[PDB]
Amino acid sequence: TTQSPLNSFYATGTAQAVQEPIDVESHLDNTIA
Amino acid sequence: TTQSPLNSFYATGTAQAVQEPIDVESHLDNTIA
Ligand SMILES: [Ca+2]
Ligand SMILES: [Ca+2]
Secondary structure (H helix, E strand, C coil), X not given: CCCCCCCCCCXXXXXXXXXXXXXXXXXXXXXXC | CCCCCCCCCCCCCCCCCCXXXXXXXXXCCCEEC
């Protein structure tokens, strides 16, 4: 004679974010002379 | 000279319930990245 609560069910996922939106690189190779 | 009550007859059955109505299994194998 056991009474159960009937709520022992689960499901699991994951998420992440490990980088910045943009990357910037420079090529200014001229001199104001 | 014996007086009988005439109620000595019986029949027996059985019943059971040994499991929960539903079972749940998860397959969430994608990542919000
Ligand atoms: Ca970066
Ligand atoms: Ca079960």
